[PDB]
Paper text:
[name] relies on a dinuclear metal center (rather than cysteine) for catalysis (Egloff et al, 1995; Goldberg et al, 1995) and is considered to be regulated largely through binding to specific targeting and inhibitor proteins, with little known about its physiologic redox regulation (Heijman et al, 2013). The [name] catalytic domain displays a compact ellipsoidal structure with its dinuclear metal center situated at the base of a shallow groove on the molecular surface (Egloff et al, 1995; Goldberg et al, 1995). Recombinant [name] is typically expressed in the presence of manganese salts, thus leading to a mostly Mn‐Mn center, but a previous report suggested a mixed Mn‐Fe center (Egloff et al, 1995). Our metal analysis on [name] crystals detected both Mn and Fe ions (Mn:Fe ratio ~1:0.175), with anomalous difference electron density maps revealing the presence of Mn at both coordination sites.
However, a one‐electron reductant, ascorbate, efficiently reversed [name] inactivation. H2O2 treatment causes an overall shrinkage of the [name] coordination sphere by 0.12 Å compared to ascorbate‐treated crystals consistent with the oxidation of the dinuclear center. A transition from Mn(II) to Mn(III) or from Fe(II) to Fe(III) upon H2O2‐dependent metal oxidation would shrink the ionic radius of the metal by up to 0.14 Å (Cotton et al, 1999), thereby shortening the bond distances between the metal and coordinating residues and increasing the energy barrier for phosphate hydrolysis. In our crystallographic studies, two cysteine residues, C127 and C273, were often observed oxidized to a sulfenic derivative in electron density maps. Cys oxidation appears independently of H2O2 treatment as we have observed sulfenic acid derivatization also in ascorbate‐treated crystals. C127 and C273 are peripheral to the metal center and unlikely to affect enzyme activity, and we found that a [name] C127/273S double variant exhibited the same catalytic activity as wild‐type [name] and responded identically to H2O2 treatment.
Author numbering: 6 to 299
C-alpha cells in the first residue's frame, strides 16, 4: 500500500531550494511511515550490533535542509550506511520533513539505516519544544500521537564492531551489563529516573570525578574515570554520543575515549556552531566531515 519511492522522491524534490519550503505529504502516508517503521523497530534489537563502514550523526532538531546537507556530504542512502543518535524533532521549523525522510529511509533500507532514540523522542518533551505545535498547525493532534507510538519503539543504543558504544545521552550508574539494555521493554515512555532515562539524558563533565548532579534537573553527569572504567570493563574503545551543542561539530572527552557529535549547524539560529558527521571504516578508523554554518 505504502509507496515509499514516491514519498522519498517528493521529500528530496526540494533539494537545493532556500530553506523553509515545505513538502506536503498526505496524512495517510505519514501515518503509514509511522506504522511500518514501528514494526521494523520492534523486529530489530533494542541494542543494535552494527558493522562498519558507517556514517554517524548527532542532533538534527527539525533543521531539514541541514539533514539534506548531511546526505549530500555523506552520500544519499544506500551509497552510505547511517546511524543517527536521536533528537530528530523540536526547535527547528521542519520536524515533519526531517522525521519523515528518516523513517522513509528506514523502511526503504532497514539493514543499512538506523535511528536511535533521543530524549526529544518522548511525548512529554516534544509537546513543549515544537513538534506538537508543528503537527497541530500542519495536520492534527492524532498524527502527533501516532508519532509517539512510533518513538516509544525506537532502539536505545548501538555497538559498532564490538568497540564503539553509541547512545544519545550517556552512561548510567545502573549500567553494569549490556543485558540490562537488552531487557528494556518496548513500547515504553521515557521515565524520570533509571537506566533508560540516563542513556538519553546524562552528560560528561570535566569538573566531576565520579557521578554528580546534572544541571538539567534530571539524570547525572559523569567524569573521565567513569568513562575509562566503562570502556575497560566492557572491552570497548570509544563512547559516541550527542545531546550537547559543540562549537566544532564534534568534541573529544577523556583523552579521546568519548566523543560528542552534533549535526545541526547554526543550532536554533542562535549558536554559530558547525555540524559534524563521524565516518567509521572497515579498519575501525574514525574520521570527521565538517559542515560550517551558512
Ligand atoms: Mn538535542
Ligand atoms: Mn538531547
Amino acid at each position: 500500500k505504502l509507496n515509499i519511492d514516491s514519498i522519498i522522491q517528493r521529500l528530496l524534490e526540494v533539494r537545493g531550494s532556500k530553506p523553509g519550503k515545505n513538502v506536503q505529504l498526505q496524512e495517510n502516508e505519514i501515518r503509514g511511515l509511522c506504522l511500518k517503521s514501528r514494526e521494523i523497530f520492534l523486529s530489530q534489537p533494542i541494542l543494535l550490533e552494527l558493522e562498519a563502514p558507517l556514517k554517524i550523526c548527532g542532533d538534527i532538531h527539525g533543521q531539514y535542509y541541514d539533514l539534506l546537507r548531511l546526505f549530500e556530504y555523506g552520500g544519499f542512502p544506500p551509497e552510505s550506511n547511517y546511524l543517527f543518535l536521536g533528537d530528530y524533532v523540536d526547535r527547528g521549523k521542519q520536524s515533519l520533513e526531517t522525521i519523515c525522510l528518516l523513517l522513509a529511509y528506514k523502511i526503504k533500507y532497514p539493514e543499512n539505516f538506523f535511528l536511535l532514540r533521543g530524549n526529544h523522542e518522548c511525548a512529554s518533551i516534544n509537546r513543549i519544544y515544537g513538534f506538537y505545535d508543528e503537527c497541530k498547525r500542519r495536520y492534527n493532534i492524532k498524527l502527533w500521537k501516532t508519532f509517539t507510538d512510533c518513538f516509544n519503539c525506537l532502539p536505545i543504543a548501538a555497538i559498532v564492531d564490538e568497540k564503539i558504544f553509541c547512545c544519545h545521552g550517556g552512561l548510567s550508574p545502573d549500567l553494569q551489563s549490556m543485558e540490562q539494555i537488552r531487557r528494556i521493554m518496548r513500547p515504553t515512555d521515557v521515565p524520570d529516573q533509571g537506566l533508560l532515562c540516563d542513556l538519553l539524558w546524562s552528560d560528561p563533565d570535566k569538573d566531576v570525578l565520579g557521578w554528580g548532579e546534572n544541571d538539567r534537573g534530571v539524570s547525572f553527569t559523569f567524569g573521565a574515570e567513569v568513562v575509562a572504567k566503562f570502556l575497560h570493563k566492557h572491552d570497548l574503545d570509544l563512547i559516541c554520543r550527542a545531546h550537547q551543542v559543540v562549537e566544532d561539530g564534534y568534541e573529544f572527552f577523556a583523552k579521546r575515549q568519548l566523543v560528542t557529535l552534533f549535526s545541526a549547524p547554526n543550532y536554533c539560529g542562535e549558536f554559530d556552531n558547525a555540524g559534524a558527521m563521524m565516518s567509521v571504516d572497515e579498519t575501525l578508523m574514525c574520521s570527521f566531515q565538517i559542515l560550517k554554518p551558512a
